[PDB]
Amino acid sequence: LAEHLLKPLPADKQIETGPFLEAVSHLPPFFDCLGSPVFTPIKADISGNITKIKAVYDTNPAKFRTLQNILEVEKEMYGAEWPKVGATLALMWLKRGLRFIQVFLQSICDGERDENHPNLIRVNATKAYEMALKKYHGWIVQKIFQAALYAAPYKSDFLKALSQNVTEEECLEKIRLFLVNYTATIDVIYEMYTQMNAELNYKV
Ligand SMILES: CCCCCCCC
């Protein structure tokens, strides 16, 4: 995780699109290592949105230099169909997948656990779902999440998968390092959606 740190935010809190997409493109591969085919469509969603954004960027890298540039250009370019269109829509869902990973990792690092089932990560995933995704899912998808929860690896196994021959404590310290700029970046993205009134709450 800490081999592909996100850059700190610059003083003007503008996120450059190219470096951002390069950075987060390192996350979907972690889903191949969780030991379940349940993760294949999850990986496709997150990668699919990165791809959607990268393809808008590639048409005009200068015009789409920053994530802010994307939202403002698309607002102008699309009129009434915006923000439910283009790279704006893909980023709206990408941020929520990114926020999920953030809350989950942070929960693990903060030592939140089920006292009764200490080596499970179900409480951490459940928190992350509630905070990042749940309100945008209808009852069917929520039910699928409840089923998929059972495919979670054991905590000890998860951390081992993210790690070199390194202790669990060492692994978590590196996860903490990653979370600094990751969290900061996602926060700026969420703030941007709020300022631009680009957030939608439709359920799927
Ligand atoms: C620089 C972004 C590349 C697009 C990859 C989509 C899969 C994670």
UniProtKB/Swiss-Prot annotation:
SUPFAM superfamilies in alphabetical order:
Glycolipid transfer protein, GLTP
This protein's GO CC annotations: cytosol
The organism's place on the tree of life at top rank: Eukaryota
Region feature 2 X 12 AA approximate tandem repeats, mapped onto this chain: 42-63
sequence repeat boundaries on the chain = 42-52, 53-63
Q: Name one Pfam family in it.
A: GLTP
One GO BP annotation here? response to immobilization stress
The impact of changing residue 202 to L is: No loss of activity; 90-97% residual activity
Q: Which InterPro entries match?
A: GLTP_sf, Glycolipid_transfer_prot_dom
Q: Which residues form a coiled coil?
A: none
Kindly list the GO molecular function terms attached to this UniProt entry. Answer: ceramide 1-phosphate binding; ceramide 1-phosphate transfer activity; glycolipid binding; glycolipid transfer activity; identical protein binding; lipid binding; lipid transfer activity
**Tissue and organ expression note:** Detected in fibroblasts (at protein level). Detected in fibroblasts and in various cancer cell lines.
Keyword match DNA-binding: no
Broad class of where this protein is predominantly found: cytoplasm
**Which residues does the annotation say bind beta-D-galactosyl-(1->4)-beta-D-glucosyl-(1<->1)-N-[(9Z)-octadecenoyl]-sphing-4-enine?**
45-52, 137, 202
Q: Where in the cell is it found?
A: Cytoplasm
User: What mutagenesis or variant effect is reported for residue 52 to I?
Assistant: No loss of activity; 90-97% residual activity
What keywords would UniProt list here?
A: Acetylation, Cytoplasm, Lipid transport, Repeat, Transport
The free-text function statement in the UniProt record for this protein reads: Accelerates the intermembrane transfer of various glycolipids. Catalyzes the transfer of various glycosphingolipids between membranes but does not catalyze the transfer of phospholipids. May be involved in the intracellular translocation of glucosylceramides.
Subunit arrangement? Monomer.
- Family that this chain belongs to: Belongs to the GLTP family.
* Protein known as: Glycolipid transfer protein
Gene that encodes the chain: GLTP
